[PDB]
Design a protein around this ligand. Structure first.
Ligand SMILES: Cc1cc2nc3c(=O)[nH]c(=O)nc-3n(C[C@H](O)[C@H](O)[C@H](O)COP(=O)(O)OP(=O)(O)OC[C@H]3O[C@@H](n4cnc5c(N)ncnc54)[C@H](O)[C@@H]3O)c2cc1C
Ligand SMILES: Cc1cc2nc3c(=O)[nH]c(=O)nc-3n(C[C@H](O)[C@H](O)[C@H](O)COP(=O)(O)OP(=O)(O)OC[C@H]3O[C@@H](n4cnc5c(N)ncnc54)[C@H](O)[C@@H]3O)c2cc1C
Ligand SMILES: CN1CCN(C(=O)Nc2ccccc2)CC1
Ligand SMILES: CN1CCN(C(=O)Nc2ccccc2)CC1
Ligand SMILES: [Br-]
Ligand SMILES: [Br-]
Ligand SMILES: [Br-]
Ligand SMILES: [Br-]
Lengths: 489, 487
């Protein structure tokens, strides 16, 4: 049996790796091999062909949040005249999980067929690692002593293996799960603790809250004072209130110290403070770390950053000339469309004689909390460090429909942050139904260097939430040399 | 007799914007006239305007209510179980909640008048007595009792529009959207007449709240509903309305309506076909509301179509008399009337002329599912530009393969000047489309090109990211003719 040779070998058939591989083969006629550890979703390795987003990430979690939203819809419908037997309502988690599994598997199968049909784009099943500057080895397991399935000669090598959940080293950590296992729970937990203040903890808190059996309770804990670091602070505070209003208990300034099993098999959590909580599931969502351990990067000398991700320049190049890295493995912005963009730019540069680097600024993104967040660009306290004068335009109100629905706690927040010296829009931050859909074209605006006057001159679409972005002409307040104040001096 | 800088006839979308801005931003003395202080019969529109009282605001609440018919059925695919036989749609509860919200807005505008210096409200019917005198009378009759005589340096006509009713035998047994907002019971069988957004939106409202055995029919005299919107979307919304149980009768037009002994209506179409319904709602158009203004007293000129004629700065032919909003018979949208009112006041009472831009105005249809659009449709672009490219994406979103509403294709189209990539129009059909389109309207004011969309990083997973995923045209227009490939 002989080794096979390629222009490009991609380790990791995920969001970025598949974009790079497909573009290299179909746009530029190169011979490409792509390596992944599993052909469809789930245990044992969870991620698989298609990547983390497709298998245990954006795609299934969005379907599950959509399912969770129906708890709100069913209740809110009564204000509009809908009547039905409320005591008959049940949330069948097994049906949700089965429908999600079938959708993800359909995507898996379609990716499998792309490889069969596409000239110069081949898929190899196994664990990829670096043997030398121009040889990728594919083994049966992540153990470098496991059997060799293939050796792939490569002129160019792309590392795109993504990330993995981080688990804290506390006694009893073996009684806990991550988001990977959450996607496959046989039954919805009656009592669950989600640990972490980031988007995965918050999103799963919403999902469990809707599907919990009778008498259930969802608790989210976070070790610092206010969840969702990195997002607009008004929105951080409001999401906390609206989660609380829908029955989720938020424990800030708390952190698990150990976990043990009660005699009935439930989990007994003791926090560093000495508080205790009995739950049926502990889901850790305290961060994700780049997946570099299994690549054997020492064999070729690829440098990692202090944080632990592959060091890259603006063109995704490592310190080894023909070896590149994109996506979560670079430990920067961990978003699927950023990995895809980096992959396309890399391939245009290397094989297309059209150099291009990814712009990591002004990236629009969302949190599918209930209600959701959409954001693009800088938060005001960051802007205040860079610009002498910052203006903040802010509208916050319960929309009229939620005065009828009964969910009066659902305040919509729209904020625009500007460089007041010239009006340029530095960031836009939204909380409320539709926010992830509204924010997409906002990203186009910011890439075109829109000013606040460009928004205000635009005629609103009425009645919408989005029109609030086009009706703000006077700052709510300012930052002058870093200092917050209602008026300029 | 009382003296004012500005007298506004019509306390509506544009008239309230103009009056409030004149008083608070320019310190002027302002009087505003309307015929009713709160919503509903007998005059329907009132303080706040058509949008507030019998327009955008209440109809959006009722469309939201109607969407729950879809949400309840679609929840099942995501594991929600309940007793489907127990579901019923209480129209009376919907109407009462709508009435309370509108009334709250009416009261809010009252207090705005009580709280604002130099801004006064007068109840009654305004007309032009002379070039600088506005008379307020008890009724629309120009011989009813005078209540006020208002002299004005400047007069603003802002009386809006009114439903058009065809001259057919039995038209008196039909209603318009005005009465639809106040029906005591949801009609079991209803015919909505017209192909425009009001007919389409009410068809979806009635379809969700109809009692058992009910049926909604929409008829339209030409071949395809929603003229002026993107053709792909006109066809798809036809298909998706049909998929939800609405009967679309194209190339049909009522010729007469008669009374049945049980109180229902017998409609006879020009083709000879007949249909018995409980309610016939006419939504074939709205026309400028000019008859009660006595424009003959001063000589304000109308267009052949019946709008008050204006220049780009909303000026009539009579100096110091202006017109904005639906009475000018242009774009009949609330945000446009607001923009015109503010531009007018900035011009007259400030030192910077401003004119409203009527191009690239984003708008929506709250059909189920809804439409969002901004800018030119491809056949209008093809007449103005030598080379037009159309970028098209149309698919059923993954969630609706699970929900069971597989008919709900999302449609996204981008129309460009292919000579330089400039985006000329964007057209959307699907959940969230009115919200997605708003910032697209900002993009078109930054001369966005298709590559500006495609080079922007998407937000995933959303429907909106489709707008940033389209690189290659689906087809073209060259010198006005449609073709798949360039020549
Ligand atoms: C729960 C969750 C929700 C998320 N939601 C969103 C969202 O809504 N929006 C968003 O933009 N992002 C979201 N993300 C992030 C998104 O999933 C990642 O940013 C994106 O998938 C990273 O792409 P990538 O190409 O770096 O790697 P991935 O898509 O992770 O692909 C890496 C692949 O490498 C394979 N692999 C690993 N090691 C090896 C090896 N040695 N040999 C061969 N193959 C290997 C893995 O099996 C995997 O398939 C979410 C993530 C999670 C965990
Ligand atoms: C069913 C329906 C739905 C709509 N939905 C939308 C939508 O979703 N979005 C949108 O943008 N637009 C919508 N519109 C259009 C919108 O309502 C109008 O464009 C807007 O209200 C017109 O503003 P205006 O200032 O011209 O007049 P209006 O807001 O109509 O106000 C005119 C006022 O003048 C008063 N008046 C009339 N004659 C006299 C007189 N002689 N003396 C004193 N007062 C008088 C009337 O009582 C009324 O209050 C809708 C319209 C309808 C009918
Ligand atoms: C221009 N916008 C209009 C909407 N809006 C509100 O204040 N709305 C509102 C609705 C119901 C109760 C309270 C407030 C913000 C400004
Ligand atoms: C970039 N987009 C992604 C979405 N998309 C689809 O076709 N969606 C789809 C729907 C159901 C099953 C499979 C795919 C168009 C292209
Ligand atoms: Br279950
Ligand atoms: Br401005
Ligand atoms: Br018609
Ligand atoms: Br037609």
């Amino acid at each position: 049996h002989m080794s096979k040779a390629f222009d490009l070998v991609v380790i990791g058939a995920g969001s970025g790796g598949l974009e790079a591989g497909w573009n290299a083969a179909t746009l530029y006629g190169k011979r490409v091999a792509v390596v992944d550890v599993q052909t469809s979703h789930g245990p044992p390795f969870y991620a698989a062909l298609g990547g983390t987003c497709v298998n245990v990430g954006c795609v299934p979690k969005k379907l599950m949040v959509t399912g969770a939203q129906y708890m709100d819809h069913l209740r809110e419908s009564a204000g509009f005249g809908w009547e039905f037997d409320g005591s008959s309502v049940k949330a069948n988690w097994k049906k949700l999980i089965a429908a999600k599994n079938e959708a993800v598997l359909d995507i898996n199968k379609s990716y499998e067929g792309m490889f069969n049909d596409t000239e110069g784009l081949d898929f190899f099943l196994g664990w990829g690692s670096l043997e030398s500057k121009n040889v990728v080895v594919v083994r049966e397991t992540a153990d470098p002593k496991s059997a060799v399935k293939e050796r792939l000669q490569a002129d160019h090598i792309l590392l795109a293996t993504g990330s993995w959940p981080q688990m804290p080293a506390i006694p009893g950590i073996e009684h806990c799960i991550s988001s990977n296992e959450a996607f496959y729970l046989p039954e919805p937990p009656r009592r669950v603790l989600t640990v972490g203040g980031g988007f995965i903890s918050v999103e799963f808190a919403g999902i469990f809250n809707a599907y919990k059996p009778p008498g259930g309770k969802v608790t989210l804990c976070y070790r610092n004072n206010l969840i969702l670091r990195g997002f607009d602070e008004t929105i951080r505070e409001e999401v906390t209130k609206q989660l609380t209003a829908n029955g989720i208990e938020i424990m800030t300034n708390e952190n698990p110290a150990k976990v043990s099993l009660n005699t009935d098999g439930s989990k007994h959590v003791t926090f560093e403070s000495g508080k205790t909580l009995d739950v049926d599931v502990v889901m850790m969502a305290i961060g994700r770390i780049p997946r570099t351990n299994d690549l054997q990067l020492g064999n070729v000398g690829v440098k990692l950053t202090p944080k632990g991700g592959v060091q890259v320049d603006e063109f995704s190049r490592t310190n080894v000339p023909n070896i590149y890295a994109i996506g979560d493995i670079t430990d920067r912005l961990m978003l699927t469309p950023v990995a895809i963009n980096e992959g396309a730019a890399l391939v245009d540069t290397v094989f297309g004689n059209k150099p291009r680097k990814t712009d990591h600024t002004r990236v629009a993104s969302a949190v599918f909390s209930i209600p959701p967040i959409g954001t693009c660009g800088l938060i005001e306290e960051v802007a205040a460090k860079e610009f002498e004068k910052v203006a903040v335009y802010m509208s916050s109100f319960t929309p009229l429909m939620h005065n009828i629905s009964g969910s009066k706690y659902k305040k919509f927040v729209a904020k625009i942050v500007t460089n007041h010296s010239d009006g340029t829009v530095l960031g836009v931050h939204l909380l409320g139904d539709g926010a992830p859909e509204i924010i997409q074209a906002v990203g186009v605006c910011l890439r075109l260097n829109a000013k606040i006057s460009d928004f205000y001159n635009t005629i609103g679409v009425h009645p919408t939430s989005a029109e609030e972005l086009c009706s703000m002409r006077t700052p709510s307040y300012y930052y002058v040399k870093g200092e917050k104040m209602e008026k300029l001096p």
